[PDB]
Structures are given as structure tokens and as C-alpha cells.
Design an enzyme around this catalytic site. Sequence first.
Site, short mmCIF file in Angstrom:
data_model
loop_
_atom_site.label_atom_id
_atom_site.label_comp_id
_atom_site.label_asym_id
_atom_site.label_seq_id
_atom_site.Cartn_x
_atom_site.Cartn_y
_atom_site.Cartn_z
N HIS A 46 -46.30 -13.76 2.12
CA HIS A 46 -46.76 -12.63 2.93
C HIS A 46 -48.05 -12.07 2.40
O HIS A 46 -48.23 -12.00 1.19
CB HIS A 46 -45.78 -11.50 3.04
CG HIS A 46 -44.40 -11.98 3.29
ND1 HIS A 46 -43.47 -11.83 2.32
CD2 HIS A 46 -43.84 -12.65 4.32
CE1 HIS A 46 -42.34 -12.37 2.77
NE2 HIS A 46 -42.52 -12.88 3.98
N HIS A 48 -49.36 -8.48 1.83
CA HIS A 48 -48.90 -7.09 1.66
C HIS A 48 -50.09 -6.16 1.82
O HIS A 48 -51.24 -6.56 1.68
CB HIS A 48 -48.18 -6.95 0.35
CG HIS A 48 -46.85 -7.64 0.29
ND1 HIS A 48 -45.70 -6.92 0.13
CD2 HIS A 48 -46.49 -8.93 0.42
CE1 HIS A 48 -44.68 -7.78 0.07
NE2 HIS A 48 -45.13 -8.98 0.25
N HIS A 63 -45.22 -5.33 3.58
CA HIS A 63 -45.99 -6.30 4.35
C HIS A 63 -47.12 -5.60 5.09
O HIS A 63 -46.97 -4.49 5.62
CB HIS A 63 -45.17 -7.09 5.34
CG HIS A 63 -44.10 -7.87 4.69
ND1 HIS A 63 -43.17 -8.56 5.43
CD2 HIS A 63 -43.80 -8.11 3.39
CE1 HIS A 63 -42.31 -9.13 4.62
NE2 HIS A 63 -42.69 -8.91 3.35
N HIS A 71 -40.77 -7.08 11.25
CA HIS A 71 -40.92 -8.36 10.54
C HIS A 71 -40.52 -9.52 11.45
O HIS A 71 -39.48 -9.43 12.18
CB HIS A 71 -40.12 -8.34 9.25
CG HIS A 71 -40.20 -9.58 8.45
ND1 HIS A 71 -41.35 -9.88 7.74
CD2 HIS A 71 -39.40 -10.63 8.33
CE1 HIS A 71 -41.20 -11.03 7.17
NE2 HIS A 71 -40.01 -11.54 7.52
N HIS A 80 -45.16 -8.80 11.59
CA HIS A 80 -46.25 -8.12 10.85
C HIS A 80 -47.45 -9.05 10.82
O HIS A 80 -47.30 -10.27 10.77
CB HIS A 80 -45.82 -7.81 9.42
CG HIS A 80 -44.58 -6.99 9.34
ND1 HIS A 80 -43.63 -7.23 8.43
CD2 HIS A 80 -44.25 -5.89 10.03
CE1 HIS A 80 -42.71 -6.26 8.54
NE2 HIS A 80 -43.02 -5.46 9.59
N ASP A 83 -47.14 -11.62 8.09
CA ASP A 83 -45.97 -12.53 8.10
C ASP A 83 -46.39 -13.99 8.17
O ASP A 83 -46.50 -14.51 9.31
CB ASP A 83 -44.99 -12.14 9.19
CG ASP A 83 -44.30 -10.86 8.89
OD1 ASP A 83 -44.33 -10.43 7.71
OD2 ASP A 83 -43.70 -10.31 9.77
N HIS A 120 -42.61 -14.90 -2.74
CA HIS A 120 -41.32 -14.22 -3.01
C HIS A 120 -40.26 -15.16 -3.60
O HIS A 120 -40.36 -16.40 -3.53
CB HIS A 120 -40.83 -13.60 -1.73
CG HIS A 120 -41.59 -12.37 -1.36
ND1 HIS A 120 -41.14 -11.09 -1.70
CD2 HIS A 120 -42.72 -12.19 -0.68
CE1 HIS A 120 -41.99 -10.20 -1.25
NE2 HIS A 120 -42.97 -10.84 -0.63
N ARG A 143 -40.93 -10.25 -6.01
CA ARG A 143 -42.31 -10.79 -5.94
C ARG A 143 -42.59 -11.62 -7.17
O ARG A 143 -42.75 -11.07 -8.27
CB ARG A 143 -43.24 -9.59 -5.84
CG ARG A 143 -42.86 -8.71 -4.67
CD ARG A 143 -43.69 -7.45 -4.52
NE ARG A 143 -43.18 -6.70 -3.40
CZ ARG A 143 -43.79 -5.72 -2.75
NH1 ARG A 143 -45.03 -5.38 -3.05
NH2 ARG A 143 -43.19 -5.11 -1.74
ZN LIG Z 1 -43.13 -8.87 7.43
#
Ligand SMILES: [Zn+2]
Lengths: 153, 153
Positions: A46, A48, A63, A71, A80, A83, A120, A143
Site C-alpha cells: 500500500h 500510506h 492508507h 479499502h 483507496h 490500494d 505488510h 508494517r
Molecule cells: Zn486501503
Amino acid sequence: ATKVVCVLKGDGPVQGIINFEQKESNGPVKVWGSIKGLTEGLHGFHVHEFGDNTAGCTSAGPHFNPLSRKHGGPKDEERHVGDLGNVTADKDGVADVSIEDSVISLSGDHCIIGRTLVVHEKADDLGKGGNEESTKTGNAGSRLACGVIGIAQ
Amino acid sequence: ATKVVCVLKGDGPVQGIINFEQKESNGPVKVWGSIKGLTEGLHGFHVHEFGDNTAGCTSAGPHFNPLSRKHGGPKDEERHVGDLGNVTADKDGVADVSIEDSVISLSGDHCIIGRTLVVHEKADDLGKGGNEESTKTGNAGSRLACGVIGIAQ
Ligand SMILES: [Zn+2]
Ligand SMILES: *[Se]c1ccccc1C(=O)NCc1ccccc1
Ligand SMILES: *[Se]c1ccccc1C(=O)NCc1ccccc1
Ligand SMILES: [Zn+2]
């Protein structure tokens, strides 16, 4: 004609170099590179919101979601901007990243420059997970590694 | 109203956190924070062109110079956009950074987001050094620590 890059660092070493290229401001972004040190399987991947690594990857915030959507997976309209789904590591712990995305950009309100790329702990369920957290984080957990997304030559 | 941050890290003892804030779209930028692990004295302090840390701080390229000017000090008309002069470390090796600059910006063509902040080995001579390299790098030597400049909350 726009090139952007991110160096992912985290414990493992989970480490990687991710390149981004966008031929036109109206155009898709190609995303490619390598991440090593991963457990076999899917890892949520992702952008962020904050390019803030003051206290590690947690400083990056949620995100990147400039449009205030839920999401999802990269192929979903409801996602997002940040994403990018999952990268997949093999038994060697290497994820070969090869993504093309039309929602992230290297210009405009959807620009990812100065934000944080995060890989992640777990799979992103692409919001199809049927708990509340699916629609927010994809249940991708902690993370492992991150970096600030920067302008490349 | 815009806040930006940079975590300085490198291969040796030098590390720091630098914050940037710009109250108005084209107004001055406040720069503040702390860098430790430095030798006593002046260390050149620049925004470099590329937010590329692929191979460490060298990947950042030359001083950020969108206007094709010569190197100078922050209070000179003839400067690179990225020319933030020197930070000064004490015997404890700590530089307390407190800068206000009107040339950098957190928006537009002078925007430093996605670029790299670098703290150097030696003093920047602010282009007054009377050799050719004075007008290019300020003779500030190698790159002790750097980070990509990211959007903050
Ligand atoms: Zn997301
Ligand atoms: Se990324 C972004 C977001 C909003 C408005 C403009 C831009 C953009 O053009 N990025 C700046 C830039 C400059 C030079 C090289 C790469 C990116
Ligand atoms: Se200012 C700048 C420089 C390079 C690339 C993008 C941008 C930018 O303006 N991004 C949009 C932005 C910046 C700060 C806060 C929110 C959004
Ligand atoms: Zn300069």
C-alpha cells in the site's frame, strides 16, 4: 517521463527497491522491483498517507485515501488510492513486483510522491474479508518495511 | 498549514529529524529539528534533486536547482533552491536546526517534497570559497546522512 522510487527497509531484512514510472500525467503507472526477506505468500502492498518515518512505518498513518473511499483491491472502483493489493513472495522470500495501476499517479491530487510505500505482514483480503477491518486495512497486519516515495532521475 | 518531515540516516553515526512548515502557499518555510553524531563545526545542509536513496545518499544527485543558478548561501539571491547553508554542531556533536527560508517551498516548482535532505561532512563555503567547486557544491564534501522529504500530518 516521470520516474519515482522507494527504498523499503524493515527488519528481516525485509528490504526492497520499488520503481514507479508514468509516461503521461493522464496515464497508468508501472510499478516494478524486488523485495526480499519476506515469508512465502501474499503481503499487502500500500501507499500510506504520510511520508513520515519519524518513529518507523507506523508514522506513515493510514492508507492514502484522498477520495474518502473504503479499502479494496487495485482492480476495484471502491478502493483507496493507495490500494496496490498484494506482492507475492516465494519460498526464497523474494517478491518480484510487476504492477500497472491507473489510480495512483505521479502528478495531481492522486500523486504518491512524498507518501510512504509499505509492505505488510499478512495478505490483504482486498476488502472481501467480511469483517470491519477488511474495509479499512484489508487485515494485512503489521508494517514489515517502508520508505518515502521520492523523485527519481 | 503544510507540514513536511525528513528522517536523516546514513552509514555512520549521523542521524536527525528535520521538520518543515509553511503557513501560506508561497510564504516562508520554517525548518527545525536536531541532528546528532556530527563533528563540531559547520556541516553543509542541502536539498538535493532526487528522492532516490537506492545506493545511499549519492543517489540523491546534485543540489536541487530548478532555476539553473550557481551555488550560494540561503541569504544570497544567487543560490540553488536547495541551498540551506550550514547547520552547526557543538562539541557534543548535536546541531540544533532553526532556519526560516523564503526560497524553498512545500508547493509549486520550488517544492522540496520527494527530494532528499542531506547533511554533509564539511562546511559549505556558501559559494565564497574562490574555487570552481565553491559555485557548485560549496565544498561541503561527502554525505553523512540523508532522507527523502515526506508529507506530514
Ligand atoms: Zn486501503
Ligand atoms: Se506529484 C504532484 C502533485 C500535485 C501537483 C504536481 C505534482 C508534480 O508535478 N510532481 C512534481 C515533480 C517534479 C519533478 C519531477 C517529478 C515530480
Ligand atoms: Se509540493 C510537491 C512536490 C513534488 C510532488 C508533489 C507535490 C505536491 O504538491 N503533492 C500534493 C500535496 C502536498 C502536500 C500536502 C498534500 C498534498
Ligand atoms: Zn547549492
